[PDB]
């Protein structure tokens, strides 16, 4: 149906494409059950409200005006859409010159950034997300959020434009890693698409 307000973007690789870090069964369920549900429930939650014809970014920026169903599903739809875009089967991507310079000046090195994101992801108690965001004015920051909340939402304390998000809900890693969230975090770097992260950085700075 072309007329639904929000749609999932088709995955740009096969479910088994990310097997260097994420099992195929998880990819299938995570995309076709969890993420699909957020999209469908978002379209239902906004129907008949002032969010009905708003962009996802505008819904998130005003999300406290709306129901909890709008918050949770707007978050879930945005977050998962971003997540698929920042994964790739193509090994060896790296930050753009501009992003690498910013990472090095702000954290010291790519390894230092990864360590900070790993720690943020590990420290998120319960369900949530780890993020790299660009704050207003352009500074990179690492944060985490609960459940499907994100850095675009009006009440989130550390606000900014996400350029990388990593899902630390247990559904994202339990089939392959069970309790070992730290091993998921260490391994997922092998499938992070730094070209997409860099494109999002470029767009955030405009």
Binding site for its own copies (CB under 8 A): 25, 29, 33-34, 68, 72, 125-128, 146-148, 169-171, 174-175, 178-179
By the 8 A CB rule, do 51 and 68 touch? Answer: no
Work out what residue 147 binds among its own copies, Mn ion, none; the CB cut-off runs from 5 to 8 Å by kind.
Answer: its own copies
Q: Which is nearer to Mn ion, 1 or 68 (CB)?
A: 68
Q: Are 13 and 21 in contact (CB under 8 A)?
A: no
Instruction: Decide whether 96 or 147 has the Cβ nearer to Mn ion.
Output: 147
User: Closer to its own copies at the Cβ: 32 or 90?
Assistant: 32
- Residue with smaller CB distance to Mn ion, 27 or 142: 27
CA distances from 206 to 148, 152, 200 (A): 26, 16, 10
Q: Closest separation between CB of residue 177 and its own copies, Å?
A: 11
Shortest distance (Å) from residue 35 CB to Mn ion? 7
Structure tokens, 200: 């999002």
At its nearest, how many Å lie between its own copies and the CB of residue 148? 8
Residue 167 contacts which entry, its own copies, Mn ion, none (Cβ below 5-8 A, type-dependent): Mn ion
Give the integer Cα–Cα distance in Å for 199 and 206: 11
Residues near Mn ion (CB under 5 A) are 167, 169
Q: Which is nearer to its own copies, 1 or 68 (CB)?
A: 68
Q: Are the CB atoms for 145 and 131 separated by under 8 Å? A: yes
């Amino acid at each position: 149906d072309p007329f639904t307000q929000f749609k999932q973007t088709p995955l740009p690789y096969a479910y088994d494409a990310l097997e260097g870090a994420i099992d195929a069964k998880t990819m299938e369920i995570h995309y076709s059950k969890h993420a699909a549900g957020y999209t469908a429930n978002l379209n239902k939650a906004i129907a008949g409200t002032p969010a009905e014809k708003e962009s996802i970014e505008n819904i998130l920026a005003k999300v406290s005006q709306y129901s909890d169903a709008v918050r949770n599903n707007a978050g879930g739809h945005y977050n998962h859409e971003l997540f698929w875009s920042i994964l790739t089967p193509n090994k060896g991507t790296k930050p753009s010159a501009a992003l690498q310079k910013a990472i090095d000046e702000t954290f010291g090195s790519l390894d230092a950034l990864k360590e900070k994101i790993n720690a943020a992801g590990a420290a998120r108690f319960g369900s949530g997300w780890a993020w790299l965001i660009v704050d207003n004015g352009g500074k990179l920051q690492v944060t985490s959020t609960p459940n499907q909340d994100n850095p675009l939402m009006d009440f989130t304390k550390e606000k900014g434009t996400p350029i990388l998000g990593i899902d630390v809900w247990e559904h994202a890693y339990y089939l392959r890693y069970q309790n070992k969230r730290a091993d998921y975090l260490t391994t997922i770097w092998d499938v992070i698409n730094w070209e997409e992260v860099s494109a999002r950085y470029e767009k955030a700075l405009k």
